[PDB]
Amino acid sequence: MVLSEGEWQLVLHVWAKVEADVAGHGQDILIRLFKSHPETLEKFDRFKHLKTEAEMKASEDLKKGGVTVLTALGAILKKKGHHEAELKPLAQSHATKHKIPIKYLEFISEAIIHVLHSRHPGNFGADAQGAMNKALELFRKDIAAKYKELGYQG
Numbered sequence: 412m413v414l415s416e417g418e419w420q421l422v423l424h425v426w427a428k429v430e431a432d433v434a435g436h437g438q439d440i441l442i443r444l445f446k447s448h449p450e451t452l453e454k455f456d457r458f459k460h461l462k463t464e465a466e467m468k469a470s471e472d473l474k475k476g477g478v479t480v481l482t483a484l485g486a487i488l489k490k491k492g493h494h495e496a497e498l499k500p501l502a503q504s505h506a507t508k509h510k511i512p513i514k515y516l517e518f519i520s521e522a523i524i525h526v527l528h529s530r531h532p533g534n535f536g537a538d539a540q541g542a543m544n545k546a547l548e549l550f551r552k553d554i555a556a557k558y559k560e561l562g563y564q565g
């Protein structure tokens with residue numbers, strides 16, 4: 412699929428606000444995921460034991476994981492669809508080391524969209540959420556295609 416430059420601009424505009432606090436947004440996103448979809452927590456051998464939202468908030472390991480996720484994702488969006496080199500190593504570790512089903516990527520997408528909506532109401536109106544949703548659906552699509560070539564899912 413293809414995003415127009417205007418949709419890309421919508422996406423990189425909100426993203427620039429995210430980047431004012433990568434660590435905070437990363438915590439919010441992971442916690443939102445793990446609360447909504449507890450089964451995802453189990454994939455994280457280093458976080459698996461955390462029982463409550465308060466423990467999550469206090470974990471320096473979870474905060475570090477969030478920055479990683481967002482830092483990686485940010486590098487992809489900034490490519491505006493020309494993200495083939497970037498997707499390859501991510502698709503390989505997520506399919507063959509971590510074994511992350513596509514379904515779980517949909518879940519974190521929903522969590523990203525939830526947090527932007529709460530923290531940036533002004534820069535995340537309907538048009539901007541439609542564009543981020545498209546950007547994330549592109550990402551998921553391309554990653555699903557890579558999984559299949561690598562021998563996972565599909």
Ligand code: HEM
Nearest residue numbers: 451454455457479480483484501504505509511515516519
């Ligand atoms: C926006 C989507 C995501 C991005 C950009 C992302 C990116 C990354 C990055 C850059 C790493 C470190 C290097 C590597 O192993 O590839 C990583 C590690 C990891 N990711 Fe993801 N990830 C995403 C989604 C997920 C989801 C949804 C899960 C599980 C439900 C997950 C589970 C893991 C695990 C288990 C590791 C290893 C953590 C540790 O033990 O160091 N990832 N991810």
